[PDB]
Design an enzyme around this catalytic site. Sequence first.
Site, mmCIF file in Angstrom:
data_model
loop_
_atom_site.group_PDB
_atom_site.id
_atom_site.type_symbol
_atom_site.label_atom_id
_atom_site.label_comp_id
_atom_site.label_asym_id
_atom_site.label_seq_id
_atom_site.Cartn_x
_atom_site.Cartn_y
_atom_site.Cartn_z
ATOM 1 N N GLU A 165 -1.828 -1.796 0.993
ATOM 2 C CA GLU A 165 -0.874 -1.832 -0.100
ATOM 3 C C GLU A 165 -0.165 -3.174 -0.287
ATOM 4 O OE1 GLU A 165 -0.149 -0.184 -2.634
ATOM 5 O OE2 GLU A 165 -1.166 1.740 -2.352
ATOM 6 N N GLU A 184 -12.170 3.973 21.164
ATOM 7 C CA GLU A 184 -10.856 3.755 21.778
ATOM 8 C C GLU A 184 -10.937 3.225 23.201
ATOM 9 O OE1 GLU A 184 -11.577 8.217 22.512
ATOM 10 O OE2 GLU A 184 -12.292 6.588 21.192
HETATM 11 C C1 LIG Z 1 2.915 0.960 -6.645
HETATM 12 C C2 LIG Z 1 1.923 0.099 -5.937
HETATM 13 O O1 LIG Z 1 1.979 -1.124 -6.061
HETATM 14 N N1 LIG Z 1 0.902 0.669 -5.099
HETATM 15 C C3 LIG Z 1 0.739 2.078 -4.858
HETATM 16 C C4 LIG Z 1 1.965 2.825 -4.387
HETATM 17 O O2 LIG Z 1 2.902 2.269 -3.795
HETATM 18 C C5 LIG Z 1 -0.147 2.732 -5.885
HETATM 19 O O3 LIG Z 1 -1.447 2.450 -5.533
HETATM 20 C C6 LIG Z 1 -2.044 1.221 -5.754
HETATM 21 C C7 LIG Z 1 -1.960 0.832 -7.200
HETATM 22 C C8 LIG Z 1 -3.476 1.306 -5.309
HETATM 23 O O4 LIG Z 1 -4.353 1.740 -6.111
HETATM 24 O O5 LIG Z 1 -3.803 0.957 -4.134
HETATM 25 C C9 LIG Z 1 -0.049 4.229 -5.885
HETATM 26 O O6 LIG Z 1 -0.472 4.730 -4.668
HETATM 27 C C10 LIG Z 1 -0.945 4.781 -6.954
HETATM 28 O O7 LIG Z 1 -0.508 4.337 -8.189
HETATM 29 C C11 LIG Z 1 -0.872 6.271 -6.901
HETATM 30 O O8 LIG Z 1 0.220 6.792 -7.560
HETATM 31 P P1 LIG Z 1 0.521 8.318 -7.522
HETATM 32 O O9 LIG Z 1 -0.681 9.008 -8.135
HETATM 33 O O10 LIG Z 1 1.788 8.652 -8.296
HETATM 34 O O11 LIG Z 1 0.765 8.755 -6.087
#
Ligand SMILES: CC(=O)N[C@@H](CO)[C@@H](O[C@H](C)C(=O)O)[C@H](O)[C@H](O)COP(=O)(O)O
Lengths: 293, 297
Positions: A79, A110
């Site tokens: 992320e 592991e």
């Molecule tokens: C907000 C951000 O910058 N990243 C995250 C969450 O912090 C988002 O993911 C990214 C875009 C990915 O594709 O890796 C989120 O997980 C999805 O938009 C799912 O949103 P949801 O369906 O409401 O749970």
Amino acid sequence: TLITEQRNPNSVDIDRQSTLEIVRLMNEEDKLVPLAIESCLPQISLAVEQIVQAFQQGGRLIYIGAGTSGRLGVLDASECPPTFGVSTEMVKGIIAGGECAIRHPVEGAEDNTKAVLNDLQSIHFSKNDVLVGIAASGRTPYVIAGLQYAKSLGALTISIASNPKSEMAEIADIAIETIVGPEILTGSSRLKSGTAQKMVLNMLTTASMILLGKCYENLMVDVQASNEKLKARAVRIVMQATDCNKTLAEQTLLEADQNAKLAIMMILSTLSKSEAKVLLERHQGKLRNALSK
Amino acid sequence: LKSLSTLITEQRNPNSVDIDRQSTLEIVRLMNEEDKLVPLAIESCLPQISLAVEQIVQAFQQGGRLIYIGAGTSGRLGVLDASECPPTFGVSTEMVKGIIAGGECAIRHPVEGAEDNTKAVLNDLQSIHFSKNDVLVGIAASGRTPYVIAGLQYAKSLGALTISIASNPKSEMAEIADIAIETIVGPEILTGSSRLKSGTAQKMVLNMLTTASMILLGKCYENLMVDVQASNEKLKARAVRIVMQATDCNKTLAEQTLLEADQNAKLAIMMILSTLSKSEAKVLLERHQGKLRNALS
Ligand SMILES: CC(=O)N[C@@H](CO)[C@@H](O[C@H](C)C(=O)O)[C@H](O)[C@H](O)COP(=O)(O)O
């Protein structure tokens, strides 16, 4: 004899309780986890500061673990580029057994102290990098050998475990010890220990990136807009920070290559794109400093 | 900026307006204070979570599977929880499955547009032969991720039981699903960062859905997971240990009983505690649905 392996006296009758009682019990135990992290705040705080310092010297945040721990490491690292706009190299999750271990088992992964050497060398792990070893047990050999190699290079080592005075803790410069108590299902470290590990990792990345200026106020100014929600959030973020309208936010964002931090810099400074880029760079992407000056 | 201002997940947290100026320890303390809110939010969801577990248990007994879908962190957490089930419970890889928007490419990094692609969820569900006997759990913090929405619609159209997990109340996902689980964790510390409190809430809920359902299938003796079939050397050591732990017997009896029970630890435990032979113990255990302590009266 480890806490992670102990039986939990409040779950002894779980095999004969009702659906509601079981989930109530789990939810009850869950309340223990944030309290368990609270004891660890000073070590976590020190970890972040050292991570930030390492980031400033060109090092990376490297997570290693096996099974659930390794998967949590990958999850947290995944992320970072879309949230904070950094490269995939900056925070890397390494898991015992490689790419397939994310979903699948890998017999002996592991226990393979030879593989962790290869795994860290193939990413050119160095003295400037930070290694976080993650294992609820505190004795996963793959993680132990990893920590040992990192320490031998003079790299900062962080251990996250759920048993006190582990071998991992002994080796590591910083010992985060999330004492969450015996699991509801005996030995199921994926439960509370997994939850704690996610909380801790979430802190290590979020806090360190906030401190590197990968946000502004509480706005995700470095978000990479790869979908409709995110594209709309970037526009929203520009409006929130500048009080401008949707038309101006989209226009500037377009001009700033969908970089909301740059866009905000452009709008609150009336500077051109190239000059806003220049000033931001000169303040290490710290928008507040770039506007304060 | 569309209708995002309406959703708690996209709202700003009053406590973190100045978080870019707060000290390192203030930042982690705040994240920790906010974490405390999450088990509380899940407390108010226990009746819906219960309903969901009970449904999942029926499905398991009818030969159905537990299917997770989501994008991003949600998808990843579905995959995480499902990945743990075969070693934790000695079950088949098919029994709990995690599907994530954009497939295997999305596991380590975002896939551009994947959560928006409402056609792809149809292919993904059909490729694992999703049927009306299966249970679909749609996982999305926002409660409005179109990938997941279309997932549920398709499942509902088949007659499959549907469950949603979201962090905004009265979501579109909740409307579609039979069972709505609504983990209201409040605005995130970094606005819109749903990987945080919502992610934690999601993991907690998933962990309950699999752990509690497996317990209800009779996999446990007291708080030990005892359903292990010693198909190789390392499962044998694990079985011997769990037989010993359950009955307080020695390595000798545990190893011998394991042999007589055709490497089935649960049946071995049954034989030891009941004093019955293999065939007898088998019959009595079946009469109580494979629930050990109920069978031992
Ligand atoms: C907000 C951000 O910058 N990243 C995250 C969450 O912090 C988002 O993911 C990214 C875009 C990915 O594709 O890796 C989120 O997980 C999805 O938009 C799912 O949103 P949801 O369906 O409401 O749970």
